[PDB]
Structure 1
């Protein structure tokens, strides 16, 4: 009869992201005439640590083509780029690590970092550290490009979508065991209130579907339908299968 945890997360109050010390939204520069037709040269000024994010951010400085002014972007750092390096964004940009150019102008098999989901928005795909997408095929008739997302799923996008070349820095961060409840505490204190996690079987029936019983047992199948109401769908949601993955 009580609103469960997970239901309370959508209200926001105590579960909002900790964004006090975040350095800004990491994103490409807006597509403009210079990037749509030629290229524009920027210079990497610093590579910084964004709290709550494993990928380093790159602070790149461009020239505004219409006003005497300097523009500072907050690219996602592709691995290998350094300060004092020139990166080039545009259609005519060359195929080098850190450059930003449309997918339609890249050979099949190119590894990319900050890929646009829609032509014009800034980078949306393969942004987490060590991840990358791959260009698979081109359809110049429909102005389409087929790519392979980090999850393995294939996706057809417009050829005007831009991406950074290379993998995103931050390497194999998940390889190191955390080893300590304290290090998990510091990891999630920079992200949001999602830790520690109390098992539902350890709760009372009032605050969880799995709660209650004289033994800590689920009592009902933990696989739950997709259209189950909020407050009921806990456990394995819409699970196509369960159990140890044998076969692939």
Structure 2
């Protein structure tokens, strides 16, 4: 039969991200001497709106200790920062909201965001609007630290990776209903073409594993495993359960 809708995402023809009007990739500073053995003053000049992102972007300018040139970077704007606040960064930086510092310095229960998986990749985990991570279980030997992620997973990471202290601003973004198709169309036109959302039962048999027949019924068990080939994994992909929840996660 025909190639399904799910297989067209890998071509990158019309399903790419709408990437021009974005301001830039939100990263931390590439780690160096001033952030591993001290701290350095930085000034947030203005916060801006990266399109396709509900979290605000912050434009923090630094000073280069090696050449006379003011370098400008793009942080994720933490909650409560304001233009003109001296955003500090480094190892021995004092714990305040906005100051990015490694997790080995901060105590347990420190609510941070925009942390790193590996030390030095400039911010990977907990970057969406209104999310945070919980820092627990430090270790003197075997430099590791548990972090509770926004999904509830407790990941053991290194002790040298960095994290901006605070939560990501823009929290509560999913509180308002979109309330019409128009704001959803403008939201997805800002983000990417992720919206040919057509029901797989309503579409044809030759184009989807579910559709067709004189009645709009699935006809097949929608719980389809991970060993299934491409064009087959539709519906519930490797579903360990279904139906209404009972507890929160029940996963060790």
Tell me the TM-score range normalised by the shorter chain.
over 0.9
1:3 deviates by: 0.3
1:113 deviates by: 1.1
Whole-angstrom CA distance in 2 between matches of 1:156 and 1:246: 27
Task: Please state whether the residue corresponding to 1:21 is helix, strand or coil.
Answer: coil
RMSD: 0.6
Whole-angstrom CA distance in 2 between matches of 1:239 and 1:140: 40
Whole-angstrom CA distance in 2 between matches of 1:29 and 1:98: 14
1:139 deviates by: 1.1
Give deviations 1:105-143, integer Å, cap 9, x for gaps: 110000011100101111001100000001011011001
Task: Please state whether the residue corresponding to 2:201 is helix, strand or coil.
Answer: helix
Q: Which residue in the other structure is 1:155 paired with?
A: 155
1:196 deviates by: 4.2
- Report how many residues are paired: 247
Q: For structure 1, list consecutive stretches of 5 or more residues without a partner in the other structure.
A: none
1:162 deviates by: 0.1
1:148 deviates by: 0.5
TM-score by length of 2: 0.97
1:184 deviates by: 0.2
Q: Would you say 1:170 and 2:170 are equivalent positions?
A: yes
Give deviations 1:42-70, integer Å, cap 9, x for gaps: 00000000000010000000000100000
Whole-angstrom CA distance in 1 between matches of 2:52 and 2:194: 13
TM-score by length of 1: 0.99
1:129-140 matches, cutoff 5 A: 129-140=129-140
Q: For structure 2, list consecutive stretches of 5 or more residues without a partner in the other structure.
A: 248-252
Moved over 2 A (4+): none
Whole-angstrom CA distance in 2 between matches of 1:167 and 1:28: 15
